[PDB]
Design a protein around this ligand. Structure first.
Ligand code: SF4
Ligand code: SF4
Ligand code: SF4
Ligand code: SF4
Ligand code: FCO
Ligand code: FES
Ligand SMILES: [Mg+2]
Ligand code: NI
Lengths: 234, 178, 581, 452
């Protein structure tokens, strides 16, 4: 760690060229994020990581650390902009947490609690995508999927290439790369890194739900800031 | 003058009202400080006018709309309580299906029905809407209490706050959507 | 990493029914799993059209709507008992919509199996309705119907130089064969991007040349794309050979073996002429040793305005969905196939031909000190003479507008397509010069007289942004939709003050948090509507505190049908009535 | 038919859900017909289809916020069978019982103390502003404080076993996902005697009431209808598990120990155009002979026995009372109900001395099949869940017959009986209309449950 930059009036060490997000988290200084992940690196879709620098707002997962770069991660504007993004993602899908088997074990939800989100102030989109329960060990509710793309990246990296995001605009959805469009016809296996990496309730194991008592779930009274990287990340 | 509270259940399960009653003996202290208009707990058949309306449940049918509007006009502060009223809740999973196809599944096609069974027609019954909607899609909402249901501790904190004039604050440890 | 270079071409190829069989052929060809190919193909508008003998897209564009294209679509949809966006029982006809097809001057218009049909009247629709029932091949149709007019209503030194001097002549002179000299010529001219961006051309050429990688690419951006823009369409029809000269000159300047004209899907009619022209110009270099010479290719796009963003264009050409990259690295560093790449607009490269042709003094003689040179302007809308207008950069907005002859009294002008500004026609606004230092303009000017509703205009743009968003990032994917929905609510008469208050925080998030300049731009129309046409918008907000956005029946229609009721209690009112004491 | 004038109590107060009664008069001031319209419907049986099976105990319990535990366990029981498990391991069996016993305890106390006793203790005519739980809190405070605290202990039993007071998650296919800790068990056990002693007081109270008011309460009606419920093998009442028993009014066991799994050969549901609540009846008798009634008084009639002393002592007194009449009384349901509440306290008092609540035998697994039926006695009567599930693991079919649904006919009947008793002598008061709602309230109707 040769160089340093300023994150909220603090000298923060950095290996060039880590991004700001990478360097901050290495130093134990949390910044809201969703689509970033230690193994699969950045992506740039969620936008929760945004920060003020040069002298505009931009994603800290793409912002490269420079020596003596001046960075604000905590302001009223930044907390509002994030709150808003959290309302967009909730509005966009069917996040009925009360019957979701990732309630209390879900990053989107935990981020929402941490930004004191009370309700998404937008008209719901009530999308109408089909569940895919074709795989023997796995199932996919696509109305919960936030298009983080971790499942995709994970699968490219381990060679299975099972998934892909297709469509344009609000039609954008997660798709299986099989000719039939069915997860069961791809090479995806329950042992694959991709199988367990979804941070919300979209892609799940079959019949492994509601096994954890309320009170003892991954995020139960632990915001993302309070967690180690073991537990924070899928 | 004592404050007036109306309460209502639209496409709810009554669960938010039970979480309200989960304040336990504190309801005796609440009884001293407030007065209840229309509410499933009281006999008043017609709403209003009051300082606070607690609404649980989504809007699922025509009579929910007429009632929601009534409560809106009658009440200064209208509050969307529970997941149902907030984003449509688990009942809103029916927006995955065609409402005709549902009613027909339940009242005509079901293998355990008597021969001749038909979807109920009578004007005394209110028609279901095409989709379930949160209350905010129909009227303006002043506050949301999340949870399915909200904790009694939230419901209490919320009221406690409004009675004293203060602005509702929900600590992280009282917040849930599930 | 995931590049599939030829895939875009191949996907066109595989249309003269995209079945699971054809995906398997491409999957082998391209080493991509069949659904990845499907997914790429699903991103493009013109690849998702239901097959027919006659596919017809009507141009959903504000100027076409003003010329009553709405009505003329229904005069055909009615005549086949279908709705727009669906196809006939026999699979004979599909009728649907599409974004501006670069025919803003010749409205109203439509696309039909790729070929454009401008200036539609009911007599054309009636004569068309017959042509499809009698089942006649399109070539048999009067080719009068497909003629596109590239009307130039005001020449200057540039169009003059273009009309006068032939394309190949510039290769006689010695500059054309010295890369440094071309760079310098252009640097001295102070040329700036005519695609609207407006960065010094020479600067990007230099950054690209200063890179370690010897392998480099020039791409010419003829996905003109922005509604109301047709200047590229003129330059392609009128002076293709001059374009290819510029492509070659600039390719030489930056040391690029290859140079690719990326032509939008809508202009595919121009392909046979462009191939003719491309081949004629590649002779004027034949003298060069072939190892040494710049190769010229043309690539056909497939229906996306987001693909006028540099990195998305590149992604498209690498056989992937045209979604903007995460930059840096920028394309000048790592672009097409990971090699440094310059993307220049058509008008920019034509300027390059002129600048190597006439010298930098000749160029800098024209325009302002900051925005040097002549600019072309594609003017359209409520004007006696829509078409192309050369002015020096620096010209007052008014003069451009006036030179086309507003039909009604002036009201509002959209400068630089929907991405730029919507301005009222006050003298203080029309006084403003058209230059990067003042009022930036990529050449699109759209004039609206006083019959037009500012609100309804923004709504047309709101829908276009919603449709054309790449869907990659949260605030833009969702937020563009929130806007479109807010203007649906205004148009239907349900909108109130509260609806703009709930929309604000999403605009904020779009303007600040978007990943590319499309999500930043998309908030512009409603920002301008609030800032200038405040009152015209207040006039379409109901005085109620809130009103449902959907017809509350409607909603009961389904259950009315079933139960069989039409009594009052099976109907809901919208609205309510206040009352004060 | 010849009904000329219509009057409606709309909506029904101090009940859960959305119900309305219409009362059809004629020009003489006489009442031809009354009708219970259950006026809400969400369609859980149809929209749960497509979802994974393991969601059902958690989502389907959103039918109701008074007895989600009844649906939580019913779904669980059904999915046990699906996953090939009949007998649960001990720890799961005992947790599930505690959840249920607590559920019945609090639900009965919710009804009596919040919904029913405002009438029974402040009188059926009391000015509306007082005729509710707050008027009761003001007047009979120490009584209302007890009730609230009984309900609390029930819910706190559920919090411990399910994870929340309302809508838990612990009942799973095969068993339970947790046990009690020692501190939760002791904390509960320490409270349990006092709670039971207040339930005792509540029975003493409701008897004293009938002793004084019995002739008046008889005006609200009797039933000559059959009684339907779960008996255990022996065949005492067992609220968690058992097979069907039906007795005729005189009882007279018509059917006994009938496999819940075959409920579909036993039962059929009729639909009238004017309610979303269906009309279940015994197939082999058709209607209206095959109608029956369930709940508190059906159980106490049906069972041979209650397994706890104090409550069985009091059951004898309920059945003996001047002299049989009241067991088949409309308002009898209240006396039965408070007895079950005592019974549950007594169960719980005992169950929390069982160290298996801290055990490590939480869950069994067996042979997967495609169908599962789960039955339980919910507070308001017998509950049936039926699920069918693909190899997908997505539910392909759900059918629910819910407690209140069973009493559709008898509730309609009782509405009619009181309508005549109290409104034929016109003219109509608010206080006389309340008399009709009082008849409905005896059934502790759960209308969200009833319709689903
Ligand atoms: S996946 Fe997360 S945010 Fe989405 S509904 Fe489930 S728990 Fe809630
Ligand atoms: S399935 Fe999960 S990991 Fe994949 S795109 Fe959806 S949220 Fe991202
Ligand atoms: S939020 Fe949950 S508790 Fe409240 S009405 Fe909806 S289902 Fe019931
Ligand atoms: S802002 Fe986001 S969604 Fe919009 S086009 Fe750019 S990257 Fe895609
Ligand atoms: N009790 C109860 Fe709910 C009802 N009725 C169920 O089952
Ligand atoms: S983590 Fe930075 S944009 Fe999603
Ligand atoms: Mg049913
Ligand atoms: Ni219930």
């Amino acid at each position: 760690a040769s160089e340093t930059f300023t994150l909220d009036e603090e000298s923060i060490p950095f290996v060039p060229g880590q991004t700001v997000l990478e360097a901050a988290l290495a130093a134990g200084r949390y910044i809201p994020h969703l689509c970033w992940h230690p193994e699969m690196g950045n992506h740039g879709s969620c936008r929760l990581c945004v920060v003020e620098a040069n002298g505009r707002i931009q994603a800290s997962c793409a912002l490269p650390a420079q020596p003596g770069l001046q960075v604000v991660s905590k302001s009223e504007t930044l907390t509002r902009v994030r709150r808003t993004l959290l309302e967009m993602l909730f509005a966009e899908g069917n996040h009925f947490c009360p019957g979701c088997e990732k309630s209390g074990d879900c990053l989107l939800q935990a981020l929402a609690y941490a930004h004191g989100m009370t309700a998404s102030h937008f008209d719901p989109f009530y999308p109408q995508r089909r569940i895919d329960a074709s795989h023997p060990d796995l199932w996919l509710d696509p109305n919960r999927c936030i298009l983080c793309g971790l499942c995709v990246r994970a699968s490219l990296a381990e060679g299975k290439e099972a998934l892909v995001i297709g469509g344009r605009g609000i039609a954008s959805r997660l798709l299986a790369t099989s000719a039939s469009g069915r997860l069961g016809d791809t090479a995806l296996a329950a042992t694959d890194r991709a199988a367990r990496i979804c941070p919300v309730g979209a892609l799940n194991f079959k019949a492994a739900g509601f096994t954890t008592p309320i009170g003892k779930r991954r995020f139960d009274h632990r915001p993302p800031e309070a967690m180690s990287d073991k537990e924070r990340y899928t | 003058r004592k404050i007036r509270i109306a309460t209502a259940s639209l496409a709810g399960c009554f669960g938010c009202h039970m979480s309200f009653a989960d304040i336990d003996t504190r309801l005796l202290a609440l009884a001293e400080w407030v007065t209840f208009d229309r509410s499933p707990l009281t006999d008043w058949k017609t709403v209003g006018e009051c300082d606070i309306a607690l609404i649980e449940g989504g809007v699922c049918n025509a009579e929910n709309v007429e009632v929601l509007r009534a409560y809106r006009r009658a009440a200064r502060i209208l509050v969307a309580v529970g997941a149902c009223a907030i984003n449509g809740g688990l009942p809103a999973q029916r927006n995955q299906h065609r409402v005709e196809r549902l009613l027909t599944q339940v009242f005509e096609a079901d293998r355990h029905l008597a021969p001749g069974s038909r979807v109920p027609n009578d004007p005394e019954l209110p028609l279901l809407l095409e989709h379930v909607h949160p209350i905010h899609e129909i009227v303006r909402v002043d506050y949301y209490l999340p949870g399915c249901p909200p904790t009694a501790e939230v419901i209490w904190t919320f009221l406690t706050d409004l009675l004293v004039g203060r602005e509702p604050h929900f600590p992280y440890p009282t917040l849930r959507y599930d | 990493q995931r590049t599939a270079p030829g895939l875009l071409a191949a996907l066109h190829q595989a249309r003269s029914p995209l079945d699971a069989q054809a995906l398997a052929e491409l999957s082998t060809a391209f080493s991509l799993p069949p659904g990845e190919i499907a997914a790429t193909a699903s991103f493009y508008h013109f690849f998702q059209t239901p097959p027919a003998r006659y596919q017809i897209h009507f141009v959903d564009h504000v100027v076409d709507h003003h010329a009553g294209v709405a009505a003329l679509c229904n005069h055909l949809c009615a005549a086949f008992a279908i709705q727009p966006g669906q196809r006939t029982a026999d699979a004979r006809l599909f009728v649907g919509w599409t974004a501006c097809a670069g025919l803003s001057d010749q409205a109203p218009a439509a696309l039909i199996n790729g070929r454009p049909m401008p200036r539609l009247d009911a007599a054309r629709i009636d004569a068309l309705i017959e042509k499809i029932q009698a089942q006649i091949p399109m070539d048999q149709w009067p080719t009068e119907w497909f003629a596109v007019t590239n009307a130039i209503h005001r020449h200057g030194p540039l169009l003059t130089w273009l009309d006068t001097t032939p394309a190949e002549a510039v290769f006689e002179h010695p500059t054309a064969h010295d890369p440094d000299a071309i760079l310098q010529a252009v640097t001295d001219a102070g040329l700036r991007g005519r695609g609207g961006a407006g960065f010094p051309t020479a600067t990007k050429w230099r950054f690209c040349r200063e890179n370690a990688d010897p392998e480099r690419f020039l791409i010419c951006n003829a996905d003109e794309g922005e509604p109301g823009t047709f200047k590229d369409r003129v330059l392609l029809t009128r002076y293709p050979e001059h374009l290819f000269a510029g492509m070659i000159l600039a390719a030489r300047a930056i040391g690029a073996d290859k140079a690719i004209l990326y032509l939008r899907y809508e202009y595919q009619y121009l392909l046979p002429q462009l191939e003719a022209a491309r081949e004629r110009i590649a002779s004027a270099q034949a003298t060069v040793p072939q190892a040494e010479r710049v190769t010229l290719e043309i690539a056909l796009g497939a229906g996306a305005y987001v693909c006028g963003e540099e990195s998305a264009l590149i992604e498209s050409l690498e056989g992937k969905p045209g979604r903007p990259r995460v930059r840096p690295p920028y394309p000048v560093t790592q672009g097409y196939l990971g090699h440094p790449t310059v993307v220049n607009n058509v008008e920019t490269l034509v300027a390059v031909a002129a600048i190597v042709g006439n010298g930098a003094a000749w160029w800098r003689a024209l325009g302002t000190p900051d925005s040097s040179g002549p600019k072309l302007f594609c003017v359209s809308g409520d004007v006696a003479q829509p078409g192309l207008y050369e002015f020096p950069y620096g010209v007052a907005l008014g003069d451009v507008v006036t030179a086309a002859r507003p039909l009604g009294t002036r009201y509002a002008v959209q400068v630089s397509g929907p991405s730029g500004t919507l301005l009222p026609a006050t003298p203080e606004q029309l006084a403003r010069p058209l230059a990067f230092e003042a009022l930036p303009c990529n050449g699109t000017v759209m004039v609206f007289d006083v019959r037009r509703d500012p609100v309804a205009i923004v709504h047309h743009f709101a829908r276009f942004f919603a449709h054309e968003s790449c869907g990659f990032c949260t605030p833009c994917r969702v937020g563009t939709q929130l806007i479109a929905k807010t203007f649906e609510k205004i148009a239907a008469g349900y909108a109130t003050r509260f609806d703009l208050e709930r929309l604000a925080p999403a605009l904020e998030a779009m303007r600040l948090a978007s990943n590319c300049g499309f999500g930043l731009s998309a908030g512009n129309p409603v920002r301008d509507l609030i800032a200038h046409f405040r009152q015209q918008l207040e006039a379409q907000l109901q005085p109620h505190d809130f009103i449902p956005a959907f017809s509350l029946d409607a909603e009961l229609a389904a259950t009315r049908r079933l139960t069989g009721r039409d009594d009052p209690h099976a109907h809901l009112a919208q609205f309510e009535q206040p009352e004060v004491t | 038919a010849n009904a000329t004038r219509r009057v409606a109590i709309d909506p029904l107060s101090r009940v859960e859900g959305h119900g309305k009664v219409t009362i059809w008069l004629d020009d003489d001031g006489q009442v031809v017909e009354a009708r219970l319209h259950i006026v809400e419907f969400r369609g859980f049986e149809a929209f749960i289809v497509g979802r994974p099976y393991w969601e059902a105990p958690v989502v389907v319990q959103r039918l109701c916020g008074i007895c989600p535990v009844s649906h939580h366990l019913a779904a669980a029981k059904a999915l046990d069978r699906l996953v090939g498990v009949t007998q649960l391991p001990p720890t799961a069996e005992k947790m599930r019982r505690l959840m249920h016993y607590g559920q019945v305890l609090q639900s009965h106390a919710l009804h009596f103390f919040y919904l029913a006793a405002p009438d029974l203790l402040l009188g059926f005519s009391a000015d509306p502003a007082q005729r509710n739980v707050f008027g009761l809190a003001a007047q009979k405070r120490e009584l209302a404080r007890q009730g609230i605290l009984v309900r609390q202990f029930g819910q706190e039993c559920i919090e411990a076993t399910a994870g929340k007071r309302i809508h838990g998650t612990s009942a799973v296919p095969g068993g339970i996902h947790k046990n009690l800790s020692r501190r939760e068990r002791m904390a509960l056990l320490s409270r349990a005697p006092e709670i039971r002693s207040w339930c005792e007081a509540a029975v003493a109270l409701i008897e004293r009431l009938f002793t004084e008011h019995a002739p008046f309460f008889a005006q609200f009606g009797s039933f000559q209808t059959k009684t339907f419920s779960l008996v255990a093998a022996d065949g005492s009442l067992d609220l968690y598990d058992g097979t069907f028993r039906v007795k005729e009014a005189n009882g007279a066991i018509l059917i006994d120990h009938y496999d819940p799994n075959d409920y579909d050969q036993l039962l059929v549901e009729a639909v009238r155009p004017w309610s979303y609540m269906k009309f279940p009846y015994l197939k082999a008798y058709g209607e209206p002979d095959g109608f029956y009634r369930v709940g508190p008084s059906a159980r106490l009639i049906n069972c041979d026995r209650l397994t706890t002393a104090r409550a069985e002592a009091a059951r004898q007194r309920f059945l003996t009372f001047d002299q049989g009449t009241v067991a088949h009384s409309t308002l009898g349901y209240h006396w039965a109900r408070l007895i079950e509440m005592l019974h549950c306290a007594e169960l719980i008092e005992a169950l929390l001395t069982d160290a298996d609540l801290e055990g490590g035998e939480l869950r069994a697994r067996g042979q997967r099949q495609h169908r599962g039926v789960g039955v339980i006695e919910a507070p308001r009567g017998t509950l049936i869940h039926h699920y069918e599930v693909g190899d997908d693991d997505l539910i392909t079919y759900c059918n629910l017959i819910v407690s209140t649904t069973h009493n559709n006919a008898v509730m309609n009947q009782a509405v009619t009986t009181a309508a005549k008793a109290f409104l034929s002598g016109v003219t109509l008061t608010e206080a006389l209309l309340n008399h009709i709602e009082v008849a409905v309230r005896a059934f502790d109707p759960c209308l969200s449950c009833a319709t689903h």
